Amino acid sequence: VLGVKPNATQEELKKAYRKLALKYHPDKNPNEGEKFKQISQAYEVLSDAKKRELYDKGGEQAIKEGGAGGGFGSPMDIFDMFFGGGGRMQRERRGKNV
């Protein structure tokens, strides 16, 4: 979904969300505002110390987007999916029934 390969740097991803926020600029807060929020919060996860480290240490090779029963959600849910195998697989897509 992000158009990036497993060998992508967090910097690119950070850059992507910035563009995403500009691109998915809702200007309709009550309707498309939740979509923005997901990028903002997902971005915030990316900008999270632990998440950056974990990706940097040994996550990159898994960042291929499995899709097949991997916990598919929204484009921003990617991190929620990757960190969802620890008792969070029962959760829902971000922006589903909010």
CB count in 10 Å sphere of residue 13: 21
DSSP secondary structure of 25-81: --S-HHHHHHHHHHHHHHHHHHT-HHHHHHHHHHTGGGTT---TTS----TTTHHHH
- State how far the Cα of 83 lies from the Cα of 24, in Å rounded to an integer: 25
Q: Is residue 18 a contact partner of residue 46, using CB atoms and an 8 Å limit?
A: no
- State how far the Cα of 71 lies from the Cα of 53, in Å rounded to an integer: 22
Q: Hunting for tokens 């195998």 — which residue is that?
A: 85
Q: ∠ CA 31-32-38 to the nearest 5 degrees?
A: 130
- Domain ranges in the chain are 10-82
- State how far the Cα of 93 lies from the Cα of 73, in Å rounded to an integer: 5
